[PDB]
Design a protein around this ligand. Structure first.
Ligand SMILES: Nc1ncnc2c1ncn2[C@@H]1O[C@H](CSCC[C@H](N)C(=O)O)[C@@H](O)[C@H]1O
Ligand code: NA
Lengths: 265, 265
């Protein structure tokens, strides 16, 4: 009958919306993927208990190569749901799956859930001031990604904040920490020498957004690069020019150095 | 001793998270504000019933001028909830309320919910390609603001998408339509001649995000300017150059003309 893309939220099984839970509980088949992000405060068991259904977990290969062969066929005679961490269509390629649904003659609906993209609002940074976003990918082999460095540069030049999604290798259970992202950025800085990311750069770290006590820290790279921000997932933000109110929140809530209050207008 | 900032989500009373609802139910006092935005798909009465607690509504002045006299005193000896549409702190001024909480010796926690910032992912446009965001405001008397026009120009310039919030008179329950926003943008173009927004500009309109049946339309201004997109709230997006996958989604899901596949990619 129909296919539902339902977000599970930021941290635990309760970050799903009431709308999402009520709809998920009535579906005949429930699929899910847990490779696009990490929900550090729950387990498949708890999610299954809350929804009261067995969930078939799909790999990136199952989705990217066989979504129309695994999920869509059932969505023809049944109500099917496809669950994902955070919001289904944020920093994923899942939107394209709706195109496959259409071609397969399957109607699809989207149920949103809290997302890291908007959750960054808890850092006190004005969300409208964010510019282009990027992802810090783990170097592999002789391939060392560095494009995210240029994104930061372009944004900072315009006084905009840069949100940096951090890498994740779900199968290896590897989640990139803000510390690793900073290390990589310093290395890129040495090669490019654009003066974009140095030990004196002010950065912001948000770890485990969604939990009741996420880690929110702001400060210079030289002081934060070896700080313990707790378990993943983490996101790194490189702010552009700060408004006084943003600085005030970073100081009061994120433990930032009180000197950033002095904005060089 | 605890204050909870809880997001209500995008459209109706079921858009709050399970975590947000359960926490609100265990709170001694539940406050709410509807001056930053409105919940178009529901009513105070319906939200009040779902939570099963009397909800005290606060005006902009109640919050901005007297938050520490109305809400904080109670949170000193009780568990208090402060409900807001969307995701807490996405509204710029609310972040500062956490500082007021701190100075009153009150702990505060944030319970996230979907925001239009992440919800726009449903347009098929890549979230990372969005640039600086802006709000389109109605001219008045001798005042004609046009800042939002320059934001579109700077983003598009760099191949980034521009998310445009449309004017809302929360208290008067009046919404600016995408049609009105397009008319205004054409006026600004006529005045600035930047070639930023014209009859040939491709735009995307998202109406009632959060609803199971939102309106997602994409096309050129000349064709959409007088189209009916349904009841508010309306969100207008001026895409930067598209990735073929974005274009395909707009055509297949948003009813965009095949033309965009060659003109806007
Ligand atoms: N709760 C959380 N706290 C901190 N970072 C998070 C996070 N959830 C996701 N991320 C960040 O985003 C990356 C996944 S990108 C997929 C995001 C998802 N669709 C959403 O809407 O949130 C992670 O590697 C991490 O860097
Ligand atoms: Na943005």
């Amino acid at each position: 009958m129909v296919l539902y893309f339902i977000g599970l939220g930021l941290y635990d099984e309760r970050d799903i919306t009431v709308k999402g839970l009520e709809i998920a509980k009535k579906c005949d088949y429930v699929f899910a993927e847990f490779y696009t992000s990490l929900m550090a405060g729950t387990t498949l068991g708890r999610i299954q208990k809350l929804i009261g259904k067995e969930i078939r977990v799909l790999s990136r290969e199952d989705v990217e190569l066989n979504f129309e062969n695994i999920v869509l066929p059932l969505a023809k005679e049944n109500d099917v749901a496809f669950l994902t961490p955070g919001d289904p269509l944020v920093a994923t390629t899942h939107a394209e799956l709706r195109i496959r649904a259409k071609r397969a003659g399957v109607e699809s609906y989207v149920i949103h859930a809290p997302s890291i993209y908007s959750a960054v609002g808890i850092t006190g940074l004005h969300i409208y001031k964010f510019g282009k976003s990027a992802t810090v990918a783990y170097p592999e082999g002789n391939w060392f990604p560095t494009m995210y460095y240029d994104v930061i540069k372009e944004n900072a030049e315009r006084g905009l904040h840069t949100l940096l999604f951090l890498d994740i290798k779900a199968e290896k259970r590897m989640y990139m920490t803000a510390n690793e992202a900073m290390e990589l950025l310093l290395k890129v800085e040495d090669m490019k020498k654009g003066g974009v990311f140095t030990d004196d750069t002010l950065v912001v770290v948000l770890a485990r957004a969604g939990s009741l006590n996420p880690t929110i820290r702001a400060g210079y790279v030289k002081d934060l690069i070896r700080e313990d921000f707790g378990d993943p997932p983490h996101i790194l933000i490189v702010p552009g020019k700060l408004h006084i109110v943003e600085a005030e929140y970073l100081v009061e809530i994120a433990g930032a150095p009180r000197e950033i209050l002095r904005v060089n207008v």
